Amino acid sequence: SGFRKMAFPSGKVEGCMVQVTCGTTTLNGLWLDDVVYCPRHVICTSEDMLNPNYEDLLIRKSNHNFLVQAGNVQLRVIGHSMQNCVLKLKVDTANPKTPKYKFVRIQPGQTFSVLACYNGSPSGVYQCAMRPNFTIKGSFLNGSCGSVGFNIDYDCVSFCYMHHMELPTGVHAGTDLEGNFYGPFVDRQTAQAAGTDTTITVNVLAWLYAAVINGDRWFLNRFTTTLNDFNLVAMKYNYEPLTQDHVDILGPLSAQTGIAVLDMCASLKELLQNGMNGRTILGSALLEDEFTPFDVVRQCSGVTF
Amino acid sequence: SGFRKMAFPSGKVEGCMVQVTCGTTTLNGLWLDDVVYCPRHVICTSEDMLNPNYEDLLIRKSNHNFLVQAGNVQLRVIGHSMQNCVLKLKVDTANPKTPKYKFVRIQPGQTFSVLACYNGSPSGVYQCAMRPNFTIKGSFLNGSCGSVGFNIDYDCVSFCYMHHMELPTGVHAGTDLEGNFYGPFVDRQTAQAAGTDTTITVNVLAWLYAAVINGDRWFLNRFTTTLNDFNLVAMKYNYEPLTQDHVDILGPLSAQTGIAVLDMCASLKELLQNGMNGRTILGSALLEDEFTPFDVVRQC
Ligand SMILES: O=C1[C@H](c2ccc(Cl)cc2)CCCN1c1cncc2ccccc12
Ligand SMILES: O=C1[C@H](c2ccc(Cl)cc2)CCCN1c1cncc2ccccc12
Ligand SMILES: [Cl-]
Ligand SMILES: [Cl-]
């Protein structure tokens, strides 16, 4: 019993974090085999950030302009290249702690663990979700750039996020490990803002199933609805549309609890229109949307890595 | 910016988790140097739990009755002893991944990271607090016994909890790493029930200071309170009494934000009275009590 915001064990990722220094800027790098990946903005001064020509700024840097430190050991940079918004620093030593890994680009609604790092040292791990507006509601301070997001799929670390910036509202923006930004964000000091966000409907439904698995049923009702009627309600309350794929993905949770997906949609519909009436669900007075259906199944079944 | 329930990186602890088997029962063990620590109830059957005599049950066991598996490698048990409610299995191999560590017994209100494990393999990490009723609201299933709670301030892992059981209300009870249970709990199947739980006042105050640091002041007011009037009101909402120690511990946060502890107490009193009025504080519609003053300073 119990239901917590649970992150993946971070050990396999901790053994990859390094400190990258370029001029006066120090941020984090991900050392996988003989390559250290980090945000390309590490080469920029504050003035450069206003209108950077990254190819031009990078051609001016040599290998010895990049100081990479792994623990109390300096790594020798022997090559440098850019892939989208990520800098790849070829180092003379392969990381002996390199885990089985892949670079995966996630979709909005998908959750992941963030290993927040400062000066190449892991400080904490937390679970978050890629918002529908492509930002993450992370917890990051100055020096956190280069911190990564990941999932573990069996024995393989799937790196899905690298931290690049904080937006004016305090939310965060970054790239996948191929350097492609999530969202319409750019690595330049210019006016940028998070778009209006919506609630991840399939995740709220998954969390309601987790509450039922954990013994909370007050929100259940005799009613059912259709996908079309429910999607009308979802649109009204800034909830993401629920697709037939979401319904299929919720099938296992529906079978385990005996509550049809559209039966749970009718509970959600009632919660949106009436509130909780002074009640809580899994210790929350708000509908939680940062647990996917797979996270609920994994936590309520005890999947190990 | 941002404020998340943040756990310590678990790598240093993952390299210590092992699987311990005794007869039909399999749970987790913590392998530190040449000793594997695990709940002594691993030596029991379900029928032994009503009134077990652990000394009598343990004297019947030999080293080869304990199977310890670290990864895909079997460790040889060469000694066994009991310390309070923890079994210490001396193994023939020291854990090469043993981190710099200490055993610390924590007080209610303290927080720690839990590395939930099954069959000696880590499944997830989450942040917990030792409740005033000495239970933890964990996320644990059958097979999670032996999973540990810890803090990692400055490269040293401070192990503070080892999971032993789930109580009838779904909350959890365990011991420190010396085998002393937190709370009036025993590793025996008996009516023990969690006592009525209360809110960790000093932690709610710390979290309100985190919200002020992060730019939220809507809940502040022009009032102050005496410490005693605060406690009289606070107890009426099942909040823990705030002591002078708690006031002293909140000093750094009070200095950083410029809000005196008793002025923050006045705001808490008003929040308890009025609710949030459709507003949130650091993404929460409830007053959060699982961040200590130290956690707020560490994160903000
Ligand atoms: O956002 C930035 C800066 C920046 C500015 C513009 C562009 Cl396009 C990219 C990056 C670089 C320094 C780190 N930083 C931060 C990143 N995360 C959390 C931060 C919390 C407080 C203060 C700064 C933070
Ligand atoms: O509480 C127990 C059992 C037990 C019984 C008596 C005594 Cl004295 C100690 C331990 C042993 C099996 C594991 N178990 C559990 C521990 N954590 C979460 C559990 C979630 C669901 C089901 C069982 C759980
Ligand atoms: Cl900069
Ligand atoms: Cl048992």
Tab-separated table of N, CA, C and O and ligand atoms in Angstrom, chain A residues 1, chain B residues 41 49 140-145 163-166 172 186-189, ligand 2:
chain	number	residue	atom	x	y	z
A	1	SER	N	0.814	-1.204	0.000
A	1	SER	CA	0.000	0.000	0.000
A	1	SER	C	0.852	1.261	0.000
A	1	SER	O	2.061	1.215	0.248
B	41	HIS	N	12.596	-10.953	11.057
B	41	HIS	CA	11.418	-11.774	10.740
B	41	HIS	C	11.601	-12.653	9.496
B	41	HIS	O	10.729	-13.477	9.226
B	49	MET	N	4.580	-15.734	13.600
B	49	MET	CA	4.434	-14.314	13.896
B	49	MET	C	3.570	-13.911	15.092
B	49	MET	O	3.783	-12.806	15.582
B	140	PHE	N	4.918	0.579	-0.490
B	140	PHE	CA	5.573	-0.698	-0.346
B	140	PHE	C	4.592	-1.810	-0.588
B	140	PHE	O	3.468	-1.756	-0.107
B	141	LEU	N	5.044	-2.850	-1.256
B	141	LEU	CA	4.229	-4.024	-1.496
B	141	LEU	C	4.877	-5.227	-0.786
B	141	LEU	O	5.966	-5.129	-0.217
B	142	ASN	N	4.235	-6.395	-0.862
B	142	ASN	CA	4.787	-7.637	-0.322
B	142	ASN	C	6.168	-7.888	-0.987
B	142	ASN	O	6.309	-7.658	-2.194
B	143	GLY	N	7.181	-8.207	-0.185
B	143	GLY	CA	8.536	-8.394	-0.712
B	143	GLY	C	9.449	-7.189	-0.514
B	143	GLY	O	10.652	-7.265	-0.777
B	144	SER	N	8.893	-6.059	-0.038
B	144	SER	CA	9.666	-4.835	0.164
B	144	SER	C	10.423	-4.806	1.482
B	144	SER	O	11.240	-3.910	1.672
B	145	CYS	N	10.201	-5.783	2.406
B	145	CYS	CA	10.939	-5.746	3.684
B	145	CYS	C	12.431	-5.733	3.487
B	145	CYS	O	12.921	-6.312	2.520
B	163	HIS	N	12.747	-1.153	6.453
B	163	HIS	CA	11.344	-1.519	6.413
B	163	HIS	C	11.055	-2.905	6.961
B	163	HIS	O	11.716	-3.860	6.577
B	164	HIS	N	10.056	-3.021	7.871
B	164	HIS	CA	9.715	-4.300	8.463
B	164	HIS	C	8.291	-4.725	8.175
B	164	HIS	O	8.051	-5.918	7.981
B	165	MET	N	7.335	-3.774	8.189
B	165	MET	CA	5.947	-4.171	8.021
B	165	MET	C	4.994	-3.074	7.590
B	165	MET	O	5.259	-1.874	7.760
B	166	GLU	N	3.842	-3.511	7.089
B	166	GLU	CA	2.766	-2.616	6.755
B	166	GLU	C	1.694	-2.813	7.820
B	166	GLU	O	1.294	-3.946	8.101
B	172	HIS	N	3.459	2.369	7.232
B	172	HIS	CA	4.553	1.439	7.427
B	172	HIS	C	5.354	1.642	8.682
B	172	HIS	O	5.430	2.746	9.225
B	186	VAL	N	6.243	-3.631	17.215
B	186	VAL	CA	6.978	-4.867	17.398
B	186	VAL	C	6.846	-5.724	16.145
B	186	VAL	O	5.820	-5.682	15.463
B	187	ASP	N	7.847	-6.560	15.880
B	187	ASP	CA	7.826	-7.480	14.743
B	187	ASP	C	7.147	-8.782	15.174
B	187	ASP	O	7.744	-9.857	15.327
B	188	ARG	N	5.872	-8.622	15.420
B	188	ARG	CA	4.965	-9.624	15.923
B	188	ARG	C	3.571	-9.246	15.398
B	188	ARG	O	3.231	-8.070	15.335
B	189	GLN	N	2.795	-10.231	14.983
B	189	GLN	CA	1.442	-10.020	14.506
B	189	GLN	C	0.537	-9.801	15.719
B	189	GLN	O	0.101	-10.763	16.362
C	2	LIG	O1	3.855	-6.593	6.502
C	2	LIG	C1	4.268	-7.539	5.849
C	2	LIG	C2	4.320	-8.941	6.451
C	2	LIG	C3	4.604	-8.896	7.941
C	2	LIG	C4	3.739	-9.493	8.848
C	2	LIG	C5	4.001	-9.474	10.206
C	2	LIG	C6	5.149	-8.854	10.656
C	2	LIG	CL1	5.467	-8.786	12.365
C	2	LIG	C7	6.037	-8.264	9.778
C	2	LIG	C8	5.757	-8.289	8.425
C	2	LIG	C9	5.327	-9.889	5.769
C	2	LIG	C10	5.239	-9.767	4.254
C	2	LIG	C11	5.531	-8.342	3.825
C	2	LIG	N1	4.646	-7.408	4.541
C	2	LIG	C12	4.506	-6.162	3.855
C	2	LIG	C13	5.393	-5.101	3.993
C	2	LIG	N2	5.278	-3.915	3.376
C	2	LIG	C14	4.234	-3.740	2.575
C	2	LIG	C15	3.253	-4.729	2.324
C	2	LIG	C16	2.149	-4.524	1.463
C	2	LIG	C17	1.238	-5.518	1.253
C	2	LIG	C18	1.373	-6.746	1.885
C	2	LIG	C19	2.420	-6.985	2.727
C	2	LIG	C20	3.396	-5.988	2.980
